[PDB]
Design a protein around this nucleic acid. Structure first.
Length: 59
DNA sequence: GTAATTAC
DNA sequence: GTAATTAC
């Protein structure tokens, strides 16, 4: 599932950016709350990276 | 090491 | 095939 709303993230280049994730999903071991992860592209470097999403972000 | 995901 | 992502 693709993302909808922009997320405030820290990029691997060390900049804060509000980005729309390309893909979002839950990362949780069995019986654990886990986290939500987004796949982002750094808007300046083109580098793909993964970053935590707010706990209540739509998947 | 687990959990899913995908760029690399 | 593996890195990288978080919290446990």
């Amino acid at each position: 599932s693709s993302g909808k709303k922009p997320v405030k993230v820290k990029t691997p280049a060390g900049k804060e950016a509000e980005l729309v994730p390309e893909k979002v999903w839950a990362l949780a071991p069995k019986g654990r709350k886990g986290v939500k992860i987004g796949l982002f592209k750094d808007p300046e470097t083109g580098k793909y990276f993964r970053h935590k999403l707010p706990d209540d972000y739509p998947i």
